[PDB]
């Protein structure tokens, strides 16, 4: 009897914005983190198990920050341990938009 | 019949809806932000822009898997109301000096 | 005396977010700023003078945004001038994660 989903999503971006600040130099990270999140099955992403993980992570990432990449990598495996295949208009209208963005640098 | 402050609250709602979902792609939110900022002196307070921002807030809410559609539509509408004004000598130096010093941090 | 700390996080993050909107072609700028402030001296960040700075930089950044970088740059100077200068496990985790990501290509 558990759905923590929104607390998890609030708690992901907790940690994610901790990364965007900290892994500045290697852009490949943050999308890779967002990746393992969305590839992971919805049951887990909404579970209470996940909530204690993002928490014990967020606590560690705050407690000792100089270790951030351990925590990231840890979360990336945890998210990897859960998974699935994925995937029309809202797919399209996103491609068209980020093209326009990149076109403007 | 000046709808200005009513519209900002409406946009910043949408903008914030977007910060949450699309924080995935960070390029997006400040895009939308700037298409709104680069938008018209007047139309930004209008009942017309008020209806728009409301219906798009309706279906960004109503069907929120179809979001990016609505981010396009809002962009296009703001894209279709603009002006102008594009270089300040001191802010070009500061930018490039800093930017390069961030690189030299690497 | 006095200690201004919690308003200085509020004035910083206000700027720091104003920057996220107008320096978007340069994802390195904000995390740079964000971190110039972390390394920044423990006490200085509480001080009234740093509240005094953050108000004028916010005030100019709102008044003359064609000048934004004069101000981002300037905030960095003062913030650099006050510094700590303050992780063997991290090197591996960063590396193996970076390499997992390159391999994920």
Swiss-Prot record, chain B:
Q: How does it assemble?
A: Homomultimer. Interacts (via C-terminus) with TNFRSF6 (via death domain). Interacts with PAX5, SLC2A4/GLUT4, MAP3K5, TGFBR2, phosphorylated dimeric HSPB1/HSP27, CENPC, ETS1, sumoylated PML, UBE2I, MCRS1 and TP53. Interacts (via N-terminus) with HIPK2 and HIPK3. Interacts with HIPK1, which induces translocation from PML/POD/ND10 nuclear bodies to chromatin and enhances association with HDAC1. Interacts (non-phosphorylated) with PAX3, PAX7, DEK, HDAC1, HDAC2, HDAC3, acetylated histone H4 and histones H2A, H2B, H3, H3.3 and H4. (Microbial infection) Interacts with human cytomegalovirus/HHV-5 tegument phosphoprotein pp71 and protein UL123.
Query: Which residue numbers mark the cross-link Glycyl lysine isopeptide (Lys-Gly) (interchain with G-Cter in SUMO2) in this sequence?
Result: 86
Per the similarity annotation, which family is this? Belongs to the DAXX family.
This entry's comment on induction and repression of expression is: Upon mitogenic stimulation by concanavalin-A.
Domain text: The Sumo interaction motif mediates Sumo binding, and is required both for sumoylation and binding to sumoylated targets.
Protein location: Cytoplasm; Nucleus, Nucleoplasm; Nucleus, PML body; Nucleus, Nucleolus
Which tissues is this protein detected in according to the database? Ubiquitous.
Write the span of the intact protein that is present: 57 to 142 of 740
UniProt-recorded name of the protein: Death domain-associated protein 6
Q: What does this protein do?
A: Transcription corepressor known to repress transcriptional potential of several sumoylated transcription factors. Down-regulates basal and activated transcription. Its transcription repressor activity is modulated by recruiting it to subnuclear compartments like the nucleolus or PML/POD/ND10 nuclear bodies through interactions with MCSR1 and PML, respectively. Seems to regulate transcription in PML/POD/ND10 nuclear bodies together with PML and may influence TNFRSF6-dependent apoptosis thereby. Inhibits transcriptional activation of PAX3 and ETS1 through direct protein-protein interactions.
Q: After translation, how is this protein modified?
A: Sumoylated with SUMO1 on multiple lysine residues.
UniProtKB/Swiss-Prot annotation, chain C:
Q: Where in the cell is it found?
A: Cytoplasm; Nucleus, Nucleoplasm; Nucleus, PML body; Nucleus, Nucleolus
Q: How is it modified after translation?
A: Sumoylated with SUMO1 on multiple lysine residues.
What factors induce this protein? Upon mitogenic stimulation by concanavalin-A.
According to UniProt, the tissues expressing it are described as: Ubiquitous.
Say what the protein does: Transcription corepressor known to repress transcriptional potential of several sumoylated transcription factors. Down-regulates basal and activated transcription. Its transcription repressor activity is modulated by recruiting it to subnuclear compartments like the nucleolus or PML/POD/ND10 nuclear bodies through interactions with MCSR1 and PML, respectively. Seems to regulate transcription in PML/POD/ND10 nuclear bodies together with PML and may influence TNFRSF6-dependent apoptosis thereby. Inhibits transcriptional activation of PAX3 and ETS1 through direct protein-protein interactions.
Q: What is known of its domains?
A: The Sumo interaction motif mediates Sumo binding, and is required both for sumoylation and binding to sumoylated targets.
Family affiliation? Belongs to the DAXX family.
**Subunit comment:** Homomultimer. Interacts (via C-terminus) with TNFRSF6 (via death domain). Interacts with PAX5, SLC2A4/GLUT4, MAP3K5, TGFBR2, phosphorylated dimeric HSPB1/HSP27, CENPC, ETS1, sumoylated PML, UBE2I, MCRS1 and TP53. Interacts (via N-terminus) with HIPK2 and HIPK3. Interacts with HIPK1, which induces translocation from PML/POD/ND10 nuclear bodies to chromatin and enhances association with HDAC1. Interacts (non-phosphorylated) with PAX3, PAX7, DEK, HDAC1, HDAC2, HDAC3, acetylated histone H4 and histones H2A, H2B, H3, H3.3 and H4. (Microbial infection) Interacts with human cytomegalovirus/HHV-5 tegument phosphoprotein pp71 and protein UL123.
- The name this protein carries in UniProt is Death domain-associated protein 6
Protein's organism = Homo sapiens (Human)
The UniProt gene name for this protein comes to DAXX
């Amino acid at each position: 009897k558990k759905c923590y989903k929104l607390e998890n999503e609030k708690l992901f971006e907790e940690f994610l914005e901790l990364c965007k600040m900290q892994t500045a130099d290697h852009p490949e990270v943050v999308p890779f983190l967002y990746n393992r999140q969305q590839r992971a099955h919805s049951l887990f992403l909404a579970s209470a198990e996940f909530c204690n993980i993002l928490s014990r992570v967020l606590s560690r990432a705050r407690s000792r920050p100089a270790k951030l990449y351990v925590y990231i990598n840890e979360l990336c495996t945890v998210l990897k341990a859960h998974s699935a295949k994925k995937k029309p208009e809202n797919r399209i209208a996103k491609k068209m938009l980020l093209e326009e963005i990149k076109a403007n640098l």
